[PDB]
Coordinates of C-alpha atoms in Angstrom, one line a residue:
Chain A
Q14 CA 0.0 0.0 0.0
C15 CA 0.9 3.7 0.0
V16 CA 1.8 3.6 3.8
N17 CA 5.5 3.2 4.7
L18 CA 6.6 1.0 7.6
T19 CA 7.3 2.9 10.8
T20 CA 10.2 0.5 11.6
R21 CA 12.0 1.4 8.3
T22 CA 15.1 3.4 9.4
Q23 CA 16.0 5.9 6.6
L24 CA 19.6 5.2 5.7
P25 CA 21.8 5.9 2.6
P26 CA 21.8 3.5 -0.3
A27 CA 24.9 1.5 0.6
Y28 CA 26.6 -0.5 -2.2
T29 CA 29.5 -2.9 -2.9
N30 CA 31.6 -4.1 -5.8
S31 CA 31.0 -7.5 -7.4
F32 CA 34.3 -9.2 -8.2
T33 CA 33.4 -11.8 -10.8
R34 CA 29.7 -12.7 -10.3
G35 CA 27.0 -12.7 -13.0
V36 CA 28.2 -15.8 -15.0
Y37 CA 25.8 -18.3 -16.5
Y38 CA 25.4 -20.7 -19.4
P39 CA 24.7 -18.5 -22.5
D40 CA 23.9 -21.6 -24.8
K41 CA 23.8 -25.4 -24.8
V42 CA 26.8 -25.8 -27.1
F43 CA 29.2 -28.2 -25.4
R44 CA 33.0 -27.7 -25.9
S45 CA 36.2 -28.9 -24.2
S46 CA 39.7 -27.4 -23.8
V47 CA 38.8 -24.1 -25.4
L48 CA 37.8 -20.6 -24.3
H49 CA 34.7 -19.8 -26.4
Chain B
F486 CA -3.3 10.8 -46.9
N487 CA -3.2 7.0 -47.4
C488 CA -4.4 5.7 -44.0
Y489 CA -7.7 4.0 -45.0
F490 CA -9.3 1.1 -43.3
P491 CA -6.9 -1.7 -44.1
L492 CA -9.0 -4.7 -43.0
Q493 CA -10.7 -6.2 -46.0
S494 CA -12.6 -9.4 -46.7
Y495 CA -11.7 -12.2 -49.1
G496 CA -13.7 -12.9 -52.1
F497 CA -14.6 -16.7 -52.1
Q498 CA -17.5 -16.9 -54.6
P499 CA -18.7 -20.1 -56.4
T500 CA -18.2 -18.5 -59.9
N501 CA -14.6 -17.1 -59.2
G502 CA -11.4 -18.5 -60.7
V503 CA -9.3 -21.3 -59.3
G504 CA -6.8 -18.7 -58.1
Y505 CA -9.5 -17.0 -56.0
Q506 CA -10.9 -20.1 -54.2
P507 CA -10.2 -20.7 -50.5
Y508 CA -7.1 -22.7 -49.6
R509 CA -6.7 -24.0 -46.1
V510 CA -2.9 -23.4 -45.5
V511 CA -0.9 -25.2 -42.8
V512 CA 2.7 -24.0 -42.1
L513 CA 4.6 -26.4 -39.9
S514 CA 7.5 -24.3 -38.6
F515 CA 10.5 -26.6 -37.9
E516 CA 13.8 -25.6 -36.5
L517 CA 17.0 -27.1 -35.0
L518 CA 18.4 -24.9 -32.2
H519 CA 21.2 -25.3 -29.8
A520 CA 18.9 -26.6 -27.1
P521 CA 18.2 -30.4 -26.9
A522 CA 15.8 -31.3 -29.7
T523 CA 13.5 -33.8 -28.0
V524 CA 10.7 -33.7 -30.6
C525 CA 11.4 -36.4 -33.3
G526 CA 9.5 -38.7 -35.7
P527 CA 8.1 -42.2 -35.2
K528 CA 11.6 -43.8 -35.5
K529 CA 12.2 -47.1 -33.7
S530 CA 15.2 -46.7 -31.4
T531 CA 17.9 -49.3 -32.0
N532 CA 21.0 -50.5 -30.0
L533 CA 24.5 -49.1 -30.1
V534 CA 28.0 -50.5 -30.5
Chain C
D389 CA 18.7 -18.2 -88.5
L390 CA 19.2 -21.3 -86.3
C391 CA 18.9 -25.1 -86.8
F392 CA 17.8 -27.8 -84.5
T393 CA 17.8 -31.6 -84.4
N394 CA 14.0 -32.3 -83.8
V395 CA 10.9 -30.4 -82.7
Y396 CA 8.1 -32.1 -80.9
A397 CA 4.9 -29.9 -80.8
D398 CA 2.9 -31.0 -77.7
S399 CA -0.7 -29.9 -78.6
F400 CA -3.2 -29.9 -75.8
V401 CA -5.9 -27.7 -74.2
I402 CA -6.0 -26.4 -70.6
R403 CA -8.1 -24.0 -68.5
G404 CA -7.3 -20.3 -68.1
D405 CA -6.3 -20.6 -64.4
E406 CA -4.1 -23.7 -65.3
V407 CA -1.9 -21.7 -67.8
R408 CA 0.3 -20.6 -64.9
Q409 CA 0.9 -24.3 -63.9
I410 CA 2.3 -25.3 -67.3
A411 CA 5.9 -23.9 -67.4
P412 CA 9.5 -25.2 -67.1
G413 CA 10.0 -26.7 -63.7
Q414 CA 6.5 -25.6 -62.5
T415 CA 4.3 -27.7 -60.3
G416 CA 0.5 -28.0 -60.1
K417 CA -2.4 -30.3 -60.6
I418 CA -1.9 -31.0 -64.4
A419 CA 1.8 -30.2 -64.2
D420 CA 2.8 -33.0 -61.8
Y421 CA 0.6 -35.8 -63.1
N422 CA -0.5 -35.1 -66.7
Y423 CA 2.0 -32.8 -68.5
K424 CA 5.3 -32.2 -66.8
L425 CA 7.2 -29.5 -68.6
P426 CA 10.9 -30.1 -67.8
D427 CA 13.2 -27.5 -66.4
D428 CA 15.8 -27.8 -69.3
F429 CA 13.1 -26.9 -71.9
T430 CA 14.9 -24.7 -74.5
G431 CA 12.0 -24.5 -76.9
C432 CA 8.9 -22.3 -77.2
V433 CA 5.5 -22.3 -75.5
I434 CA 2.5 -21.0 -77.5
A435 CA -1.1 -20.6 -76.2
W436 CA -4.3 -19.6 -77.8
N437 CA -7.9 -19.2 -76.4
Chain D
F486 CA -14.0 -44.0 -49.2
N487 CA -11.6 -41.7 -51.2
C488 CA -10.7 -43.9 -54.1
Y489 CA -12.6 -42.0 -56.8
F490 CA -11.5 -42.4 -60.4
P491 CA -9.0 -39.5 -60.8
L492 CA -9.8 -39.2 -64.5
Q493 CA -12.1 -36.2 -64.9
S494 CA -13.4 -34.3 -67.9
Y495 CA -13.0 -30.5 -68.6
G496 CA -16.1 -28.5 -68.5
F497 CA -15.8 -26.1 -71.5
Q498 CA -19.3 -24.7 -71.2
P499 CA -20.4 -21.2 -72.4
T500 CA -21.4 -20.2 -68.8
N501 CA -18.1 -20.9 -67.1
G502 CA -15.6 -18.2 -66.1
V503 CA -12.7 -16.7 -68.1
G504 CA -10.2 -18.8 -66.1
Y505 CA -12.0 -22.1 -67.1
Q506 CA -12.3 -21.6 -70.9
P507 CA -10.3 -23.9 -73.2
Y508 CA -6.9 -22.6 -74.2
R509 CA -5.0 -24.5 -76.9
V510 CA -1.4 -24.8 -75.8
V511 CA 1.3 -25.8 -78.3
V512 CA 4.8 -26.5 -76.9
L513 CA 7.5 -26.8 -79.5
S514 CA 10.6 -28.4 -77.9
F515 CA 13.7 -27.1 -79.8
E516 CA 17.0 -28.8 -79.2
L517 CA 20.4 -29.2 -80.9
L518 CA 22.1 -32.6 -80.6
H519 CA 25.0 -34.3 -82.3
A520 CA 22.6 -35.5 -85.0
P521 CA 22.4 -33.4 -88.2
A522 CA 20.1 -30.4 -87.5
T523 CA 17.4 -30.6 -90.2
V524 CA 14.8 -28.3 -88.6
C525 CA 16.0 -24.8 -89.6
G526 CA 14.4 -21.4 -90.5
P527 CA 13.9 -19.6 -93.8
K528 CA 17.7 -19.0 -94.2
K529 CA 19.2 -19.0 -97.6
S530 CA 21.5 -22.0 -98.1
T531 CA 24.9 -21.2 -99.6
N532 CA 27.6 -23.4 -101.3
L533 CA 31.0 -24.2 -99.9
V534 CA 34.5 -23.0 -100.7

């Protein structure tokens, strides 16, 4: 709803730095001993 | 300025030409993608060696 | 101003809408089963109502 | 049960459409082979030297 929680403590939008995350399988093409 | 009603009806009359008669069209869209193609035909599976 | 070995004149009648089916390498009702005009046809095709 | 005689006659009636009228088609198959080409045009024949 349009009512904000009273327990919500207003703080700045903290952030971090992802090192190497965000990797997945882009396709189902199998390979071996190569860097596609 | 060329924005007339584009939806128009087909003329399927009994006295029209062969090129104007109705034709029930079926388009079977086949494709072979990188994903595992599990859909196949009625082929009997055999052994392997 | 040209000579040829032999000339076979295939004389037959068809319907008006069937004229588009009779051609080199063309398919159709009469083209597939009755009069198959081959694709290497290097002759002439004449039609008359 | 779908085994009708495929042989059917053309309806060349005066009440049919333009696409159903009879059209006399004549297909002359010209071709030049190793055999002597006897079918030529109205070209004047000349002697040899």
